[PDB]
Amino acid sequence: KYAVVLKTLTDPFWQSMKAGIEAEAKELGVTVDIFAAASEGDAEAQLALFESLSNKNYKGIAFAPLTADNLVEPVASAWKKGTYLVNLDDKIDMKALKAAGGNVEAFVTTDNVAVGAQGAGYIIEKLGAEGGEVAIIEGEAGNAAGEARTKGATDAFDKASNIKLVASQPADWDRAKAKQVATDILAKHPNIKAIYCANDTMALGVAQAVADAGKTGKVLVVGTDGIPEAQQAVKAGKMTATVAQNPAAIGATGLKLMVDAQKKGKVIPLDKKPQYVLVASKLVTK
Structure with a gap:
């Protein structure tokens, strides 16, 4: 199974990303549990939520970090445990992450x-x-x-x-x-x-x-x-x-990269940079 930690689930952007992840999960035939911290705008609450996804058997975790570094430590912990990690939307502090002994498979964001x-x-x-x-x-x-x-x-x-x-x-x-x-x-x-x-x-x-x-x-x-x-x-x-922006495609793409990465049987090495994946935006007119 896979897990996704979004920022919120009341913002239409994040609701649409959740919708895209679920639609992609059905296509791929994989189970994905999608979470957001109950305490909104709360960096430590998102950290605790991520850390709570440690007793579970998630093969991969995709996350949209509330801040650049609030998830550095649990993401590094997940990577060391062999979890396939995908950074969604806002970029985690990769300098801090590498210094914590961790890495992510990919970063999916808007160009x-x-x-x-x-x-x-x-x-x-x-x-x-x-x-x-x-x-x-x-x-x-x-x-x-x-x-x-x-x-x-x-x-x-x-x-x-x-x-x-x-x-x-x-x-x-x-x-x-x-x-x-x-x-x-x-x-x-x-x-x-x-x-x-x-x-x-x-x-x-x-x-x-x-x-x-x-x-x-x-x-x-x-x-x-x-x-x-x-x-x-x-x-x-x-x-x-x-x-x-296209949060649905960002989420769907993040799930696809997570599922494709786990086929490797090994997580990205520390000295490799994560895949960089840009999702196209769309003009709203009329």
Whole structure:
């Protein structure tokens, strides 16, 4: 049997990952027990949950760590016991894991450079031959996913000859700061035709700034994550689109890699790097 430790099970992202794991488990004909800590946003509770999956006979464990290092010790313990481990979504601190004498078979996550390229690419297509001025609302400095989305969008915009990136400023994943940053940007660059946002919380605030500026329907607003309010905003025309991740495929892929890894009969050696598997995201429109 196999086990999966998710972050929560109330967030639709994680519910969808659970759904994908179960659908893939049926296809593969394997039994998977899927868990989330009862105490949410609690790094030690997820640690204790993982450690509780030690008396059980799980051949492999896939996990989405609440923090970079909160599962380092139990993951190292599982690896030393021969458990086939797959890191889901957010990357475990591999430096800390290796220093603890452990490793994982694979890391399955979203390609966040491609996410930014996808949101920018949708904007480029929507602006047609005329193109125009565009802006990027960045995430908080030091966040790897946000830097990758900013890079992917910046590179895509730069390659498009009719597209001019006139602003690229952080709003620190904050809805109110994004509205204020976008309002400033729309005031200094009134010809802007599109804004890519590194996440939906910022995009929703940017959508308000565009509305407040009198440019509803005139400035495209593209978010990232596909959170429910962004999907609602896209349907209502308040946002143009959002780049949604595919947690179902992340989970299904993580299970497949776990089942394939156990066929080896031996876990990944300490001196090998885990397989790196990127899952494509999907544009939410209409």
